[PDB]
Amino acid sequence: TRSAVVLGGGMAGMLVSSMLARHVGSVTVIDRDAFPAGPDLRKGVPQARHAHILWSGGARIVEELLPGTTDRLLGAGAHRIGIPDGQVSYTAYGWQHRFPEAQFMIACSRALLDWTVREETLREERIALVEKTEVLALLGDAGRVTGVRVRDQESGEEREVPADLVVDTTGRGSPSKRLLAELGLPAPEEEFVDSGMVYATRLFRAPEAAATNFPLVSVHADHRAGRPGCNAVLMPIEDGRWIVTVSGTRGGEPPADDEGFARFARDGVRHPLVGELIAKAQPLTSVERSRSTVNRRLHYDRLATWPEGLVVLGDAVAAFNPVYGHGMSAAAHSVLALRSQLGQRAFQPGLARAAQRAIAVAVDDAWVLATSHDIGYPGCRTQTRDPRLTRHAGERQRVTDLVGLTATRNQVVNRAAVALNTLSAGMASMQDPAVMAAVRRGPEVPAPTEPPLRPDEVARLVSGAGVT
Ligand SMILES: Cc1cc2nc3c(=O)[nH]c(=O)nc-3n(C[C@H](O)[C@H](O)[C@H](O)COP(=O)(O)OP(=O)(O)OC[C@H]3O[C@@H](n4cnc5c(N)ncnc54)[C@H](O)[C@@H]3O)c2cc1C
Ligand SMILES: [Cl-]
């Protein structure tokens, strides 16, 4: 009984459809793109050309929604990288000491992650992916949405797809504002924090022996310094490759050319380690760029009127600067928020509004982590009424910087700081008395004076071939 229509078959659309099929009789996923039969790039997910970190908070939710996914990713060559034990990270506060594992991330190409999630989701035959199809309008009215009107791209024919619940997961470029304006609803409040961040990415073929058990390497901006924020990230992916993404805010954007890429990885960021490591490897692709880095949130949950049977989730409701690595985990938390409301309220007057409010809560930690750190860069453009961003800046930063600095050299503080940043714990966890006592305990290890690489990791950067 009941039917759902999901707009967009990306990460959020697949996750939400796997969940919905356990509550409704049929799910139809509408997408304007064409989908490959294997782990390939596609036009509707251009961001798959750039490094994607799947933090443990999102990975555990993906695993709850689609059992076997984590093992299938690792089984296809994805890397499980412990945090902080498997990371070499020059934070705004200095090198992170590589304490024993507190959290983890999954490292692979976004194309492999998407294919793995999609192929497992679509094993449920009550979910159908309808590709190469445009979304024309929401059916119904401002009181209740009853499906969507679509157009087949190849035939040009239009048809109505009925639904008891419509979930818009069409991503950062979602036409939700247009779809909702055509229903007669008022425009939602738009909040943005735009640092002007530009990404530049190349793929590399690293030394054959490093192809496994190599750390995630990251060189971070100092968000407190009054200069453009620049970063460099080297992440292992499947089949012996490294994806390297460099970035910079307004005034420090990376260049677009292959020859300027390595120079930026050495000299454009605060420490040259990523540039030094790519000199061991072999480039495989020319530079790809992205400007899809604005933190943008649409406050659909605060609209004065909201239709029954309509929910918006994923990048269509809240999209983040990708340097923080939260978007896929925020989408996963949002699918769980909808699932919780479905289990409490089933499908009665109020489900959609309750879910929309719960989704706003679910994305809020990722929103704060990104915006609080982007708002200070020179030339940042903002539109917000969030008092966490507009008021009490001195106090807010005092708490943030104290935890961040102490986390580099204190295992208990790092465990708490890692749990929040991977979206494995909520923001309130940081005010637990044990966390703030450890903060006051202070450092337990010296600050590293050099990148904390292990000898056994650096040894695998060379082959030894030219030696008898
Ligand atoms: C450069 C970059 C790097 C990132 N790095 C990370 C990272 O390290 N970690 C992380 O967790 N997240 C990262 N993200 C964010 C992550 O890619 C997104 O949060 C995630 O893909 C959101 O999923 P979604 O389903 O909402 O949208 P998408 O995955 O973008 O999927 C949207 C789907 O809707 C379809 N669609 C779009 N418009 C329409 C339309 N008008 N009609 C019909 N169908 C439509 C598209 O074809 C697509 O299939 C990064 C993003 C970028 C841009
Ligand atoms: Cl992109």
Coordinates of C-alpha atoms and ligand atoms in Angstrom, one line a residue:
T1 CA 0.0 0.0 0.0
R2 CA 1.0 3.6 -0.8
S3 CA 3.5 4.9 -3.4
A4 CA 6.4 7.2 -3.2
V5 CA 8.1 9.2 -6.0
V6 CA 11.8 10.3 -5.5
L7 CA 13.1 13.1 -7.6
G8 CA 16.8 12.5 -8.4
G9 CA 18.7 9.2 -8.2
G10 CA 21.9 10.4 -6.7
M11 CA 23.2 9.5 -3.2
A12 CA 20.3 10.9 -1.3
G13 CA 17.7 9.6 -3.7
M14 CA 19.1 6.1 -3.6
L15 CA 19.4 6.1 0.2
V16 CA 15.9 7.5 0.7
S17 CA 14.4 5.0 -1.8
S18 CA 16.0 2.0 -0.1
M19 CA 14.4 3.3 3.2
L20 CA 11.0 4.1 1.7
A21 CA 10.5 0.7 0.1
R22 CA 10.4 -0.8 3.6
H23 CA 7.4 1.5 4.3
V24 CA 5.5 1.9 1.0
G25 CA 4.5 -0.6 -1.7
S26 CA 6.4 1.0 -4.6
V27 CA 9.0 3.7 -5.1
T28 CA 9.6 5.4 -8.5
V29 CA 12.9 7.4 -8.9
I30 CA 12.9 10.0 -11.6
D31 CA 16.2 11.4 -12.9
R32 CA 17.1 13.4 -16.0
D33 CA 20.5 11.8 -16.4
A34 CA 21.5 8.5 -18.0
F35 CA 23.0 5.9 -15.7
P36 CA 26.0 3.7 -16.5
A37 CA 26.0 0.0 -15.9
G38 CA 29.3 0.2 -14.1
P39 CA 31.2 2.5 -11.8
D40 CA 31.6 5.3 -14.2
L41 CA 31.3 9.1 -14.1
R42 CA 28.0 10.6 -15.3
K43 CA 26.9 14.2 -16.2
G44 CA 24.4 14.5 -13.4
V45 CA 27.1 14.0 -10.7
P46 CA 29.9 16.2 -11.9
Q47 CA 31.3 16.4 -8.4
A48 CA 32.5 12.7 -8.7
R49 CA 35.6 14.1 -10.4
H50 CA 36.8 15.4 -7.0
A51 CA 38.0 13.8 -3.8
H52 CA 35.1 12.4 -1.6
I53 CA 35.6 11.5 2.0
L54 CA 32.8 9.3 3.5
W55 CA 33.1 10.0 7.3
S56 CA 32.2 7.2 9.7
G57 CA 29.0 8.9 10.8
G58 CA 27.6 8.7 7.3
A59 CA 29.2 5.3 6.6
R60 CA 27.4 3.8 9.6
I61 CA 24.1 5.1 8.5
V62 CA 24.6 4.0 4.9
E63 CA 25.4 0.5 6.3
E64 CA 22.1 0.6 8.4
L65 CA 20.1 1.6 5.4
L66 CA 21.9 -0.8 2.9
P67 CA 23.5 -3.7 4.8
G68 CA 26.7 -5.0 3.3
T69 CA 27.6 -1.7 1.6
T70 CA 30.7 -1.0 3.7
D71 CA 32.1 -4.4 3.1
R72 CA 31.2 -4.2 -0.6
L73 CA 33.2 -1.0 -0.9
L74 CA 36.2 -2.4 0.8
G75 CA 35.9 -5.6 -1.2
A76 CA 36.1 -3.5 -4.4
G77 CA 39.3 -1.8 -3.3
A78 CA 38.1 1.1 -1.2
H79 CA 40.3 2.0 1.8
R80 CA 39.2 2.1 5.4
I81 CA 41.4 4.8 6.9
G82 CA 41.4 5.2 10.7
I83 CA 41.1 8.7 12.2
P84 CA 43.5 10.0 13.4
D85 CA 45.8 6.9 13.2
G86 CA 45.7 6.8 9.4
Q87 CA 45.8 10.5 8.7
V88 CA 48.7 12.9 8.2
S89 CA 47.0 16.2 8.8
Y90 CA 48.5 19.7 9.1
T91 CA 45.6 21.4 10.8
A92 CA 45.1 25.1 11.5
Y93 CA 46.8 24.4 14.8
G94 CA 49.7 22.3 13.6
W95 CA 50.2 18.6 12.9
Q96 CA 47.7 16.2 14.4
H97 CA 49.5 13.6 16.5
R98 CA 48.5 10.2 15.1
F99 CA 46.9 8.7 18.2
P100 CA 45.2 5.3 18.0
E101 CA 42.0 5.0 16.0
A102 CA 38.9 7.0 17.3
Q103 CA 36.8 7.1 14.1
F104 CA 37.3 6.2 10.4
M105 CA 36.5 7.1 6.9
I106 CA 36.0 5.2 3.7
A107 CA 38.1 6.3 0.7
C108 CA 37.2 5.5 -2.9
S109 CA 36.1 7.2 -6.1
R110 CA 32.7 8.7 -5.9
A111 CA 31.8 6.8 -9.1
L112 CA 32.4 3.5 -7.3
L113 CA 30.5 4.7 -4.2
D114 CA 27.5 5.7 -6.3
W115 CA 27.5 2.5 -8.3
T116 CA 27.8 0.3 -5.2
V117 CA 24.9 2.2 -3.4
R118 CA 22.7 2.2 -6.6
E119 CA 23.2 -1.4 -7.5
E120 CA 22.3 -2.6 -4.0
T121 CA 19.4 -0.3 -3.7
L122 CA 17.9 -1.5 -7.0
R123 CA 18.0 -5.1 -6.1
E124 CA 14.7 -4.3 -4.5
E125 CA 12.3 -4.7 -7.4
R126 CA 9.7 -2.4 -5.9
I127 CA 12.1 0.4 -6.6
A128 CA 12.3 1.5 -10.2
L129 CA 14.8 4.1 -11.6
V130 CA 13.3 6.0 -14.5
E131 CA 16.2 7.7 -16.2
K132 CA 16.4 10.3 -19.0
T133 CA 13.1 11.9 -17.6
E134 CA 12.5 15.5 -16.8
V135 CA 10.5 16.8 -13.8
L136 CA 7.9 19.2 -15.0
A137 CA 5.6 20.0 -12.0
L138 CA 4.4 18.8 -8.7
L139 CA 0.8 17.5 -8.9
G140 CA -1.8 18.7 -6.4
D141 CA -1.7 22.1 -4.6
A142 CA -0.2 23.9 -1.7
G143 CA -2.4 21.8 0.7
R144 CA -1.2 18.4 -0.6
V145 CA 1.2 17.1 -3.2
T146 CA -0.1 14.0 -5.1
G147 CA 2.7 13.1 -7.5
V148 CA 4.7 14.7 -10.3
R149 CA 4.3 15.4 -14.0
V150 CA 7.3 14.2 -16.0
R151 CA 8.5 14.2 -19.6
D152 CA 10.3 11.4 -21.3
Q153 CA 13.3 12.9 -23.0
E154 CA 13.4 10.4 -25.9
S155 CA 9.7 10.4 -26.9
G156 CA 8.8 13.9 -25.6
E157 CA 5.6 12.5 -24.0
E158 CA 4.4 13.8 -20.7
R159 CA 2.7 11.8 -18.0
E160 CA 1.5 12.1 -14.4
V161 CA 3.2 9.9 -11.8
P162 CA 0.9 9.6 -8.8
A163 CA 2.4 9.5 -5.3
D164 CA 1.4 9.7 -1.7
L165 CA 4.8 11.1 -0.8
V166 CA 7.2 13.0 -3.1
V167 CA 10.8 13.4 -1.9
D168 CA 12.9 15.9 -3.8
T169 CA 16.6 14.8 -3.8
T170 CA 17.7 16.6 -7.0
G171 CA 20.8 18.0 -5.4
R172 CA 22.5 21.4 -5.3
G173 CA 20.8 22.4 -8.6
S174 CA 17.4 21.3 -7.5
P175 CA 14.4 23.2 -9.2
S176 CA 12.5 23.0 -5.9
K177 CA 12.1 26.7 -5.6
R178 CA 10.5 26.8 -9.1
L179 CA 8.4 23.6 -8.4
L180 CA 7.1 25.1 -5.1
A181 CA 6.5 28.6 -6.6
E182 CA 4.3 26.9 -9.2
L183 CA 2.2 25.4 -6.4
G184 CA 1.7 28.9 -5.0
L185 CA 3.9 28.6 -2.0
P186 CA 6.1 31.5 -0.8
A187 CA 9.8 31.3 -1.4
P188 CA 11.8 29.8 1.5
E189 CA 14.5 31.8 3.3
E190 CA 17.8 31.2 1.6
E191 CA 20.9 31.3 3.8
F192 CA 24.4 31.1 2.3
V193 CA 28.1 31.5 3.2
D194 CA 30.2 31.8 0.1
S195 CA 34.0 31.9 0.5
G196 CA 34.6 31.7 -3.2
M197 CA 36.3 28.3 -2.8
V198 CA 37.6 26.7 -6.0
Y199 CA 38.7 23.1 -6.2
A200 CA 41.3 21.6 -8.6
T201 CA 41.8 17.9 -8.8
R202 CA 44.1 15.4 -10.6
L203 CA 44.3 11.6 -10.4
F204 CA 47.6 10.0 -9.9
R205 CA 49.1 6.4 -10.2
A206 CA 51.2 6.1 -7.0
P207 CA 54.1 3.7 -6.2
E208 CA 52.7 0.1 -6.6
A209 CA 53.6 -0.9 -3.0
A210 CA 51.9 2.2 -1.5
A211 CA 48.7 1.2 -3.4
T212 CA 47.3 0.0 0.0
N213 CA 47.7 1.0 3.6
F214 CA 48.7 4.6 2.7
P215 CA 47.4 7.5 4.8
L216 CA 44.9 10.2 4.0
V217 CA 47.1 13.3 3.8
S218 CA 45.7 16.7 4.3
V219 CA 47.1 20.2 4.6
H220 CA 44.6 22.6 5.9
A221 CA 44.0 26.4 5.9
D222 CA 44.3 28.4 9.1
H223 CA 40.8 29.8 9.3
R224 CA 41.9 32.4 11.9
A225 CA 44.6 33.9 9.6
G226 CA 43.7 36.9 7.5
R227 CA 44.6 35.5 4.2
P228 CA 42.8 33.3 1.6
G229 CA 42.3 29.7 2.9
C230 CA 44.1 27.1 0.8
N231 CA 44.1 23.3 1.3
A232 CA 45.6 20.2 -0.3
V233 CA 44.2 16.7 0.2
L234 CA 45.7 13.4 -1.1
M235 CA 43.3 10.4 -0.7
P236 CA 43.9 6.8 -1.8
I237 CA 41.2 5.3 -3.9
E238 CA 40.7 1.9 -5.5
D239 CA 43.0 0.2 -8.0
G240 CA 46.2 1.8 -7.0
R241 CA 45.3 5.5 -7.6
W242 CA 45.5 8.7 -5.5
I243 CA 43.0 11.5 -6.0
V244 CA 44.6 14.9 -5.1
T245 CA 42.3 17.9 -4.6
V246 CA 43.7 21.4 -4.0
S247 CA 41.6 24.3 -3.1
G248 CA 41.5 28.0 -2.2
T249 CA 39.1 30.8 -1.3
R250 CA 38.8 34.2 -3.0
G251 CA 42.3 35.5 -3.7
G252 CA 44.0 32.1 -3.4
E253 CA 42.3 29.9 -5.9
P254 CA 44.4 27.2 -7.5
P255 CA 45.4 27.5 -11.1
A256 CA 43.8 25.5 -13.8
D257 CA 46.9 24.2 -15.7
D258 CA 48.6 20.9 -15.1
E259 CA 52.0 22.6 -14.6
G260 CA 50.7 25.0 -11.9
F261 CA 48.9 22.2 -10.0
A262 CA 52.0 20.7 -8.3
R263 CA 53.5 24.1 -7.6
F264 CA 50.3 25.0 -5.8
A265 CA 50.3 21.7 -3.8
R266 CA 53.8 22.6 -2.6
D267 CA 53.8 26.4 -2.2
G268 CA 50.2 27.6 -2.3
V269 CA 49.3 25.8 1.0
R270 CA 50.8 26.1 4.5
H271 CA 53.1 23.0 4.2
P272 CA 54.4 21.4 1.0
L273 CA 53.8 17.7 1.9
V274 CA 51.1 16.9 -0.7
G275 CA 53.2 18.5 -3.4
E276 CA 56.2 16.4 -2.2
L277 CA 54.2 13.2 -2.4
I278 CA 52.7 13.8 -5.8
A279 CA 56.3 14.1 -7.1
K280 CA 56.7 10.2 -6.2
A281 CA 53.5 9.4 -8.3
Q282 CA 52.5 9.5 -12.0
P283 CA 49.7 11.8 -13.1
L284 CA 46.8 10.1 -14.9
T285 CA 44.3 12.9 -15.7
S286 CA 44.5 16.6 -16.4
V287 CA 43.1 19.1 -13.9
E288 CA 39.3 19.3 -13.3
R289 CA 37.9 22.3 -11.5
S290 CA 34.8 22.9 -9.4
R291 CA 33.2 26.0 -7.9
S292 CA 30.3 24.1 -6.2
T293 CA 31.5 25.0 -2.8
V294 CA 28.9 27.5 -1.4
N295 CA 27.2 26.6 1.9
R296 CA 23.6 27.1 1.0
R297 CA 20.5 26.2 3.1
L298 CA 16.9 26.6 2.2
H299 CA 14.6 26.9 5.3
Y300 CA 11.6 24.9 3.9
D301 CA 10.8 23.8 7.5
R302 CA 10.0 27.4 8.4
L303 CA 7.6 28.1 5.6
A304 CA 4.3 29.4 6.8
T305 CA 2.4 26.8 4.7
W306 CA 3.8 23.4 3.7
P307 CA 2.1 20.7 1.6
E308 CA 1.2 17.3 2.9
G309 CA 3.2 14.6 1.1
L310 CA 6.3 16.7 0.1
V311 CA 9.8 16.4 1.6
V312 CA 13.1 17.9 0.4
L313 CA 16.4 16.4 1.5
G314 CA 20.1 16.2 0.5
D315 CA 21.9 19.0 -1.2
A316 CA 18.5 20.3 -2.4
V317 CA 17.8 21.5 1.2
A318 CA 21.4 22.0 2.6
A319 CA 24.6 21.9 0.6
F320 CA 28.1 22.6 2.1
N321 CA 31.6 23.6 1.2
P322 CA 33.0 20.1 0.4
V323 CA 36.4 20.8 2.0
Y324 CA 34.8 19.7 5.3
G325 CA 33.6 16.4 3.7
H326 CA 30.1 16.2 5.2
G327 CA 27.5 16.3 2.4
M328 CA 27.0 12.5 2.0
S329 CA 26.8 12.0 5.7
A330 CA 24.3 14.9 6.2
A331 CA 22.2 13.3 3.5
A332 CA 22.3 10.0 5.3
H333 CA 21.4 11.6 8.6
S334 CA 18.5 13.3 6.8
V335 CA 17.2 10.0 5.4
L336 CA 17.2 8.6 9.0
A337 CA 15.2 11.7 10.2
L338 CA 12.5 11.0 7.6
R339 CA 12.5 7.3 8.6
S340 CA 12.0 8.2 12.2
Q341 CA 9.0 10.4 11.4
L342 CA 7.5 7.7 9.2
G343 CA 7.8 5.2 12.0
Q344 CA 6.1 7.6 14.5
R345 CA 3.4 9.2 12.3
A346 CA 3.0 6.8 9.3
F347 CA 1.3 8.8 6.6
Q348 CA -1.2 11.2 8.3
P349 CA -1.7 15.1 8.3
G350 CA 1.6 16.4 9.6
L351 CA 4.1 13.8 8.4
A352 CA 5.8 16.0 5.7
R353 CA 6.1 19.0 8.0
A354 CA 7.4 16.9 10.9
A355 CA 9.9 15.3 8.5
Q356 CA 11.0 18.6 7.1
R357 CA 11.6 20.0 10.6
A358 CA 13.5 16.8 11.5
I359 CA 15.7 17.1 8.4
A360 CA 16.6 20.7 9.4
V361 CA 17.8 19.4 12.7
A362 CA 19.7 16.5 11.0
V363 CA 21.8 18.8 8.8
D364 CA 22.5 21.4 11.5
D365 CA 25.8 20.1 12.9
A366 CA 27.3 19.8 9.4
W367 CA 26.0 23.3 8.7
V368 CA 27.6 24.8 11.7
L369 CA 31.0 23.1 11.2
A370 CA 31.3 24.4 7.7
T371 CA 29.9 27.9 8.1
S372 CA 31.6 28.7 11.3
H373 CA 35.0 28.1 9.6
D374 CA 34.2 29.7 6.2
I375 CA 32.6 33.0 7.5
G376 CA 36.0 34.6 8.4
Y377 CA 37.9 34.3 5.1
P378 CA 38.6 37.6 3.3
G379 CA 35.9 38.6 0.9
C380 CA 33.4 36.0 2.1
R381 CA 29.9 36.7 0.9
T382 CA 27.1 35.9 3.4
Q383 CA 23.3 36.0 3.7
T384 CA 22.1 34.6 7.1
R385 CA 20.2 35.5 10.2
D386 CA 21.7 32.6 12.3
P387 CA 22.9 34.2 15.6
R388 CA 25.7 31.6 15.8
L389 CA 27.2 33.3 12.7
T390 CA 26.2 36.9 13.4
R391 CA 26.7 37.3 17.1
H392 CA 29.3 36.7 19.8
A393 CA 32.2 35.9 17.5
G394 CA 34.9 36.2 20.1
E395 CA 33.3 33.7 22.5
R396 CA 32.4 31.2 19.7
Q397 CA 36.0 31.2 18.4
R398 CA 37.5 30.8 21.9
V399 CA 35.7 27.6 22.4
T400 CA 36.4 26.3 18.9
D401 CA 40.1 27.1 18.8
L402 CA 40.8 25.7 22.3
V403 CA 39.2 22.3 21.4
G404 CA 40.9 22.3 18.0
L405 CA 44.4 23.0 19.3
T406 CA 44.2 20.6 22.3
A407 CA 42.8 17.9 20.0
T408 CA 46.1 17.8 18.0
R409 CA 48.0 16.7 21.2
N410 CA 45.4 15.1 23.6
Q411 CA 43.9 11.7 22.8
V412 CA 40.6 12.2 24.8
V413 CA 40.0 15.6 23.3
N414 CA 40.8 14.3 19.8
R415 CA 38.4 11.4 20.3
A416 CA 35.6 13.8 21.1
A417 CA 36.6 16.3 18.4
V418 CA 36.8 13.4 15.8
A419 CA 33.3 12.0 16.9
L420 CA 31.8 15.4 16.2
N421 CA 33.6 16.1 12.9
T422 CA 32.7 12.6 11.5
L423 CA 29.0 13.3 12.4
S424 CA 29.2 10.3 14.8
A425 CA 28.1 12.5 17.8
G426 CA 26.2 15.7 18.2
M427 CA 27.4 19.2 18.9
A428 CA 26.4 19.0 22.5
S429 CA 28.8 16.1 23.1
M430 CA 31.6 18.7 23.3
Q431 CA 30.2 20.1 26.6
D432 CA 30.4 16.8 28.4
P433 CA 32.5 17.5 31.6
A434 CA 35.0 14.7 30.7
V435 CA 35.7 16.4 27.4
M436 CA 36.3 19.9 28.9
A437 CA 38.3 18.4 31.7
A438 CA 40.6 16.7 29.2
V439 CA 40.9 20.1 27.4
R440 CA 42.1 21.6 30.6
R441 CA 44.5 18.7 31.1
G442 CA 46.2 19.9 27.9
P443 CA 48.8 18.2 25.7
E444 CA 50.0 14.8 26.6
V445 CA 52.5 14.5 23.6
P446 CA 54.9 17.0 22.0
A447 CA 53.7 18.9 19.0
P448 CA 55.1 17.1 15.9
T449 CA 58.0 19.0 14.3
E450 CA 57.7 17.2 11.0
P451 CA 54.9 15.4 9.1
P452 CA 54.1 12.4 11.3
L453 CA 54.7 9.9 8.5
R454 CA 55.7 6.4 9.4
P455 CA 59.0 5.0 8.1
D456 CA 57.1 2.0 6.7
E457 CA 54.8 4.3 4.8
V458 CA 57.6 6.4 3.2
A459 CA 59.5 3.2 2.4
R460 CA 56.8 2.2 0.0
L461 CA 57.1 5.4 -2.1
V462 CA 60.0 3.8 -4.0
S463 CA 60.3 0.5 -5.7
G464 CA 64.0 -0.4 -5.3
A465 CA 64.0 -1.5 -9.0
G466 CA 67.3 0.2 -10.1
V467 CA 69.3 -1.6 -7.3
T468 CA 71.1 -4.9 -7.5
Ligands
LIG1 C1 33.7 19.1 -5.4 C2 32.8 18.4 -4.4 C3 33.4 17.6 -3.5 C4 32.7 16.9 -2.5 N1 33.3 16.1 -1.5 C5 32.5 15.5 -0.6 C6 33.2 14.7 0.4 O1 34.4 14.6 0.5 N2 32.3 14.1 1.3 C7 31.0 14.2 1.3 O2 30.3 13.5 2.1 N3 30.3 14.9 0.3 C8 31.1 15.6 -0.6 N4 30.5 16.3 -1.5 C9 29.0 16.5 -1.5 C10 28.3 15.3 -2.1 O3 28.7 15.2 -3.5 C11 26.8 15.7 -2.1 O4 26.5 16.1 -0.8 C12 25.9 14.5 -2.4 O5 26.1 14.1 -3.7 C13 24.4 15.0 -2.3 O6 23.6 14.0 -2.9 P1 22.2 14.4 -3.5 O7 21.6 13.1 -3.8 O8 21.5 15.5 -2.8 O9 22.6 15.1 -4.9 P2 23.5 14.5 -6.1 O10 24.3 13.4 -5.6 O11 24.2 15.7 -6.8 O12 22.4 13.9 -7.1 C14 21.3 14.7 -7.6 C15 20.6 13.8 -8.7 O13 19.5 14.6 -9.2 C16 19.5 14.6 -10.6 N5 18.9 15.9 -11.0 C17 19.5 17.1 -10.8 N6 18.8 18.1 -11.3 C18 17.6 17.5 -11.8 C19 16.5 18.0 -12.4 N7 16.3 19.2 -12.6 N8 15.6 17.1 -12.8 C20 15.8 15.8 -12.6 N9 16.9 15.2 -12.0 C21 17.7 16.1 -11.6 C22 21.0 14.4 -11.0 O14 21.0 13.9 -12.3 C23 21.5 13.5 -9.9 O15 21.3 12.1 -10.3 C24 31.3 17.0 -2.5 C25 30.7 17.9 -3.5 C26 31.4 18.6 -4.4 C27 30.8 19.5 -5.4
CL2 CL 31.5 19.7 -9.3

